[PDB]
């Protein structure tokens, strides 16, 4: 009928708009606080700094290497990252490289196109052949770095040109062999019925016999040129023998070992600062994973198939609504200091305070979770990369499918490890809440009783000082026992 008794309710933190996280028991649990681990967003544009980026607007790396006329701006050009656009084309004598990707990767790894000419002596043979496929400027022309040798008078002799190497770096020589389409064309240019081109250093030799066939029409020609490369090391010599069909080099390309590479993309370039480059823009390397693209350049996160991986750093987020009760029905949106709290209602009035001994016990465990996830996924990443490298024996020709299943197995383990910690986080947070309800029940003993809604009903008058005695670990029930039992049993 009056202020004879008081109420002490237990509750926890709660917010209206929580975050959904994955666990093992549930597919999605709304928690109070979490963080995103994948970088699915991107500015869209590529950042010009800190790496030296080179936009090959219309010219591929090979075309700029060889000397396609519209690529002549790229001479001696250097780069940290060469980018190739989709629009890039070739407009020069039709050709083909047997090891295109191998040569493209070799020259890309060296961040330079530094070419120096050399004084080859092609005696008895006319130099600087030309084609109207590459008109160069007003007149006919050819590749910049290639010397097309054609017969002189009515004689094309056997050329044996030697060229030693007396430098500390490695030289890269690019040359070619011309494949005419008729025997008439072969005789007119080279006199001989059948040619040869031989290039060697030391043990290595390459010997190519030209093939007279009619190829698919390109730029008014059914003839083609095959491009080969040859590396000479310090102290080595380059010897070139040919009785015909020789597309000679002008010099060599000085290649340096470096951290350069190449990637195909159409993303625009902008003035910004980004460490990690992806074909669809630049992304910040602050998150552990990224969904933006598979191929990247620079210090980048790991690639992940799914566009979301959230690590729970809170507790079960149950909200409030409509219409006092504790944690059985709804959390407390008003309690913001800590994840476990007390509320009460006594003669003095309603009050509230957080329990930091249990909140700290949860925080101290959640503290090193993100770092723990990063250490484990990194080990599993380089594990899945170390193994899964062999692939049950390999065939270069048809491995397109292996990366598609590497990403799946890696994404499965990563999403599983995040779900392992989220389960552990939900477990330990709910544990500290139930342990608090046990500590208070034990403390009150027969002086109160569980009301069923996460609260107690203290059957004696318990002022704010008495309530703080319950929150503190110092509450003697024996002194209030006689008073509370009098009210009980009545």
């Amino acid at each position, epitope marked *: 009928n009056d202020n004879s008794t008081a109420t002490l309710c237990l509750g926890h933190h709660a917010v209206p708009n929580g975050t959904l996280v994955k666990t093992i028991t549930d597919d999605q649990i709304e928690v109070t606080n979490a963080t995103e681990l994948v970088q699915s967003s991107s500015t869209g544009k590529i950042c010009n700094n800190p790496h030296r980026i080179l936009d090959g607007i219309d010219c591929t790396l090979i075309d700029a290497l060889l000397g396609d006329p519209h690529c002549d701006v790229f001479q001696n050009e250097t780069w940290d990252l060469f980018v190739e656009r989709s629009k890039a084309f070739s407009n020069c004598y039709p050709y083909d490289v047997p090891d295109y990707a191998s040569l493209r990767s070799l020259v890309a790894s060296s961040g330079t196109l530094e070419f120096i000419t050399e004084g080859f002596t092609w005696t008895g043979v006319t130099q600087n052949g030309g084609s109207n496929a590459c008109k160069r400027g007003p007149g006919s022309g050819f590749f910049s770095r290639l010397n097309w040798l054609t017969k002189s008078g009515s004689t094309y002799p056997v050329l044996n040109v030697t060229m030693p190497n007396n430098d500390n770096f490695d030289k890269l020589y690019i040359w070619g062999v011309h494949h005419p389409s008729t025997n008439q064309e072969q005789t007119s240019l080279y006199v001989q019925a059948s040619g040869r081109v031989t290039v060697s250093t030391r043990r290595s030799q390459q010997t190519i016999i030209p093939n007279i066939e009619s190829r698919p029409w390109v730029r008014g020609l059914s003839s083609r040129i095959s491009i080969y490369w040859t590396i000479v090391k310090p102290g080595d010599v380059l010897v070139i023998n040919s009785n015909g069909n020789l597309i000679a080099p002008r010099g060599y390309f000085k290649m340096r070992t470096g951290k350069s590479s190449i990637m195909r993309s159409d993303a625009p370039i902008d003035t910004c600062i980004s460490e990690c480059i992806t074909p669809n823009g630049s992304i910040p390397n602050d998150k552990p994973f990224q969904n933006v693209n598979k191929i990247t350049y620079g210090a980048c996160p790991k690639y992940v198939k799914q566009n979301t991986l959230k690590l729970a750093t809170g507790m079960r987020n149950v909200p409030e609504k409509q219409t006092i009760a504790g944690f059985i029905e709804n959390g407390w949106e*008003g309690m*913001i200091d800590g994840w476990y709290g007390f509320r009460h209602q006594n003669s003095e009035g309603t009050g509230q305070a957080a329990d*930091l001994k249990s909140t700290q016990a949860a925080i101290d465990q959640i503290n090193g979770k993100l770092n723990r996830v990063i250490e484990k996924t990194n080990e599993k990443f380089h594990q899945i990369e170390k193994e899964f490298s062999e692939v049950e024996g390999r065939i270069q020709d048809l491995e397109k499918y292996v990366e598609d299943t590497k990403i799946d197995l890696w994404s499965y383990n990563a999403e599983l490890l995040v779900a392992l910690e989220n389960q552990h986080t939900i477990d330990l947070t709910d544990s500290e809440m139930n342990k608090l309800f046990e500590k208070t029940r034990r403390q009150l003993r027969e002086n109160a009783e569980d009301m069923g809604n996460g609260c107690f009903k203290i059957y004696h008058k318990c002022d704010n000082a008495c309530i703080e005695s319950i929150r503190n670990g110092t509450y003697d029930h024996d002194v209030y026992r006689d008073e509370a039992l009098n009210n009980r049993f009545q």
Partner: antibody
Amino acid sequence: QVQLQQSGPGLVKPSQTLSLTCVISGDTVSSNRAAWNWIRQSPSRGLEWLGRTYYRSKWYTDYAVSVKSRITITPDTSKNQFSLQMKSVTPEDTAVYYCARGSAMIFGIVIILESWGQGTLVTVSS
Amino acid sequence: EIVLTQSPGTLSLSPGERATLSCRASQSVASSYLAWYQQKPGQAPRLLIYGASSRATGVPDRFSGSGSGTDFILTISRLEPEDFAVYYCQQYDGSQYTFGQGTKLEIKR
């Protein structure tokens, strides 16, 4: 990047009512991510937290015990400010009073006063 | 409530040396709820360390926090003449904020 600007440094006679205001710029008083505190500082008492107010679909106010009786912190949404009233002032209430905002910094909790006002000296003298 | 006691009350140091400020607590304090502030003369307190060991935005690695229970320490590694101020430790217990008396750090010259 909130900017808190408080009222003018003045004089209030003994046994009167202290009354200050904190005009917030760059944030809302009804923010679901902030709490607005009042703190005073004097040579005798030191730094003393007086009270706070925050909005979580409802207006909550907390007060220190030493000042609970004579204080009322009221938020004003229309002017985006919140005021402090202290009553029956005594010469022990001469201090510099600080408007300060608190925001959670650890996993969504552990409110911490990180943005502070300039502080207005008020003297209780007859 | 909980009371915070700072020692020493005054500290004099030559630039380059390291300052260590201790914050003593009547009762055990939650490690996440102890912060340190810097108050330069005529200005409001500026947040330095929060949660015992966590650096705020805009403070260098010279400032680092540590401690647990009733013993918390704040260290300033590479002193500068700009680091003259009064440093306070603050705690939160549930329903109240508490501050220490402060440590006046004056730099020698």
